Amino acid sequence: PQITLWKQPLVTIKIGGQLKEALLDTGADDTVIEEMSLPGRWKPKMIGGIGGFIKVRQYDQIIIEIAGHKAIGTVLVGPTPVNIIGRNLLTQIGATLNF
Amino acid sequence: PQITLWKQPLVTIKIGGQLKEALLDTGADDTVIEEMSLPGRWKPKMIGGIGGFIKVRQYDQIIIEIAGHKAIGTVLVGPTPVNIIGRNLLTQIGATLNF
Numbered sequence: 656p657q658i659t660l661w662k663q664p665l666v667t668i669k670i671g672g673q674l675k676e677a678l679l680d681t682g683a684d685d686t687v688i689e690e691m692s693l694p695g696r697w698k699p700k701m702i703g704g705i706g707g708f709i710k711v712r713q714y715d716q717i718i719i720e721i722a723g724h725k726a727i728g729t730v731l732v733g734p735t736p737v738n739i740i741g742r743n744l745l746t747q748i749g750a751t752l753n754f
Numbered sequence: 755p756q757i758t759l760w761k762q763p764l765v766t767i768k769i770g771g772q773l774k775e776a777l778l779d780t781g782a783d784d785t786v787i788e789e790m791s792l793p794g795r796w797k798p799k800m801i802g803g804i805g806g807f808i809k810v811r812q813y814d815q816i817i818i819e820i821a822g823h824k825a826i827g828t829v830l831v832g833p834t835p836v837n838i839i840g841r842n843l844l845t846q847i848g849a850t851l852n853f
């Protein structure tokens with residue numbers, strides 16, 4: 656849909672069968688969720704932003720539904736202060752901000 | 755001017771008289787520019803992100819130009835790894851997420 660920004664762009668997502676709330680983040684390359692149990696083998700990685708770098712577990716080929724829109728890709732799980740859907744997944748669902 | 759999210763949504767902005775490039779970040783409640791000498795009375799602030807907090811100076815009622823669009827607002831200046839336009843300014847240019 657068309658989402659304005661007077662409020663944070665939070666939507667609901669379903670991963671690993673459970674619901675969770677996440678922020679549509681245009682400033683992130685990747686998708687990162689707070690620590691949870693996800694089926695599948697994972698690989699340790701480091702990612703950074705403001706503040707610095709944090710360790711996370713990278714899960715490849717995760718099926719995720721973001722506002723009823725399916726994507727299947729890389730999700731990173733670790734201690735992010737907020738769950739964010741980055742461009743890696745936003746691209747999959749056809750998100751554009753525009754002009 | 756809206757955050758064309760796919761490849762890093764970077765655009766030209768004008769602040770304090772200098773031409774700059776910034777990342778349009780839904781998910782950035784704030785705008786934070788690279789260290790620079792802006793005249794104007796400030797307030798010391800601490801903003802948090804991915805891996806922690808960063809000390810920045812807060813300037814209010816700052817006039818900036820985002821992809822040829824005029825906006826006025828609170829700009830924070832500090833040791834940021836990239837210039838970030840946050841929702842506080844994105845809303846004034848009418849930027850929206852579309853999928």
Ligand SMILES: CCCC[C@H](NC(=O)[C@H](C)NC(=O)[C@H](CCC(=O)O)NC(=O)[C@H](Cc1ccccc1)NC[C@H](CC(C)C)NC(=O)[C@@H](NC(=O)[C@@H](N)CCCNC(N)=[NH2+])C(C)C)C(N)=O
Binds near residue numbers: 701737738741803
């Ligand atoms: C595919 C490559 C992956 C490998 C990895 N890549 C990265 O780490 C890439 C560059 N990082 C990013 O893209 C990260 C997000 C993590 C990620 O995407 O993986 N982006 C980010 O962290 C971007 C800013 C940024 C962009 C580019 C470079 C640096 C920084 N900010 C995202 C973030 C979202 C929010 C939900 C936490 N927003 C902010 O950090 C803004 N903060 C705010 O708006 C605060 N008011 C939010 C509350 C914080 N406080 C609290 N909870 N008590 C700030 C910019 C004013 C690497 N190691 O190089």
